Amino acid sequence: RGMLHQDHITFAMLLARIKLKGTVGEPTYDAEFQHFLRGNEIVLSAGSTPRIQGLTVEQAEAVVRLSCLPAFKDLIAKVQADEQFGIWLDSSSPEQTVPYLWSEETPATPIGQAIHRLLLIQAFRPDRLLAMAHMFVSTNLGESFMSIMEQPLDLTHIVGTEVKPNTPVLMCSVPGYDASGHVEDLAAEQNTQI
């Protein structure tokens, strides 16, 4: 409630990771998350990157970086074998239909599958990363976890119960927005002189 709307996904994803570390039945996923955070820093020579048909130089670079993971060792072979891959790559919302391009010796849980599709989305369609991240949170914390953040803010209950008289209500607005009217309306509704 006191954060810019662009930072909601960051805090939600960190909460999802915290809950994931607290799950007895889930792996730690250290390598996949470490790559998701710091894989663009993997140094690779110009000649090491090949030219995969249908993928630009940036997508090819992302693919060859992501191939270092054991589950994506043969990613190039999988993407070249699948000819309808371009249809997904040019889809409006590819994150809803991420294709299975990682090798598993056991059927992974939906959470680990979410990390895998998330890495694939980052490698292939970075513009669709945020949406993918959102779905990741929904797999860890529920689909409604962000739902309250989409509704108009309810000042009544918060200032009536959650706010102590000692704690001031700081109302920080970006330029072009003013919360004075909200407070005046709130005081008018409660019949309280302000």
């Binding site: 662009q6 994803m13 710091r38 919302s93 945020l130």
Partner: protein
């Protein structure tokens, strides 16, 4: 929003004196549209094309046709679907319809192309990655090398134009005079400063206050304020400025060399890039003045029509000039006809600007006027061009998608 609601309330009470129901035609659509386009929402608008877009939206939404069952609030939201006007007659059903909107929203809801938020979403994702990660002398030699490379890349000579009794009467000469003079002054100043920096980095001349400030700005990659004379995008580094300035000096060198030998004839027939010119709108008005003087007409009765050639180097008429480097945003030009495109930009190879006498005839209801901005910031309006849409397009859709021409 409060002002618009107050206007709606006042005009509805004025038109409906307490009557339970009124015909949709009796609703003062013109009053609401004009007040919202001139006073409420049009007051902040200081651009004619923004006002045009606001007028387009207001004339789309605030008509009697909004009260029918078939009205589309938005079209081509995903290329197949469209947003339907709720058929409710009470606040509760409208709020219910709003609460039932799909969670997926694209800029096509706003009339913009779907590829408008690609860069924004990519940057937001990279920023989210950086934020998640975040909470988990040699400078003398480098500056010497950088300044030496800059001096090698930057041209050396730019001679002023030669004023003559009959040369002053030519507006093209009158404008290229300012261009070449300013270019030569900037070239000399920049070369002198760079040579001083090189000599300082060799420990041959003592560093002074001006040299200290210039070096401090150079090592951190900020464009010096003494060099910034023409309009540039705000967030541009010094490498990009050096490259652009070198290109501008080369173009001005070509202009001066052409003007020196031959006179004002090849001066009319020289290819120019508006992005490289320091004041392109002055070039536009100079060509307008040249055509007016050649034909002994007035400027206000001369209108401009643009012809995008399929190739560069085609011959030009006596009232048509050739300009290069123009980029069309959100549309493609084929056979002098515009089609709505899903690409970011399309490079116009060479366009002929031709000045002709006004016929006082209204446009053919299929002609779009497009602004020609100096750069991607769309902060400076150089002039306007006129094209004809494709066989199955809509000028309103052209306005809603922000189609415009960029000089660079």
């Amino acid at each position: 929003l409060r002002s618009a609601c107050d206007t709606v309330d006042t005009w509805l009470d004025d038109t409906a004196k307490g009557r339970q129901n009124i015909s949709p035609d009796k609703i003062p659509w013109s009053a609401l549209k004009t007040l919202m386009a001139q006073s409420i929402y049009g007051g902040r608008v200081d651009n004619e094309f923004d006002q045009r877009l606001l007028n387009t939206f207001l004339e789309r939404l605030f008509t009697t046709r909004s009260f029918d069952s078939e009205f589309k609030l938005a079209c081509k939201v995903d290329g197949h679907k469209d947003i339907q006007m709720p058929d409710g007659i009470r606040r509760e059903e409208f709020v219910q319809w709003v609460e039932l909107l799909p969670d997926t929203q694209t800029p096509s809801w706003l009339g913009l192309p779907n590829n408008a938020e690609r860069v924004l979403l990519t940057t937001q994702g990279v920023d989210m990655i950086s934020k998640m990660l975040k909470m988990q002398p040699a400078w003398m030699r480098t500056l010497h090398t950088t300044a030496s490379n800059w001096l090698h890349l930057i041209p050396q000579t730019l001679s002023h134009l030669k004023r003559t009794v009959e040369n002053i009467k030519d507006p093209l000469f009158r404008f290229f005079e300012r261009e070449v003079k300013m270019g030569a002054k900037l070239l000399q100043d920049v070369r002198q400063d760079l040579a001083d920096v090189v000599q300082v980095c060799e420990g041959k001349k003592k560093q002074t206050n001006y040299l200290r400030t210039l070096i401090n700005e150079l090592v951190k990659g900020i464009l010096p304020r003494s060099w910034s004379h023409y309009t540039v995008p705000a967030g541009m580094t010094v490498i990009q400025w050096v490259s652009d300035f070198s290109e501008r000096i080369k173009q001005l060198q070509n202009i001066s060399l052409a003007a020196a030998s031959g006179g004002a004839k090849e001066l009319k027939n020289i290819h120019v890039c508006l992005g490289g010119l320091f004041v392109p709108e002055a070039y536009i008005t100079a060509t307008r003045q040249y055509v007016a003087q050649a034909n002994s007409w007035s400027l206000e009765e001369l209108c401009l029509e643009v012809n995008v050639t399929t190739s560069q180097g085609a011959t030009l008429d006596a009232c048509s000039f050739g300009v290069t480097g123009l980029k069309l945003q959100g549309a493609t030009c084929n056979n002098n006809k515009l089609s709505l495109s899903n690409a970011i930009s399309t490079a116009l190879p060479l366009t002929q600007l031709r000045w002709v006498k006004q016929t006082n005839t209204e446009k053919k209801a299929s002609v779009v006027t497009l602004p020609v901005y100096l750069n991607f910031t769309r902060a400076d309006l150089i002039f306007t061009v006129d094209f004809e849409i494709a066989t199955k397009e809509d000028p309103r859709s052209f306005y809603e998608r922000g189609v415009a021409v960029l000089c660079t």
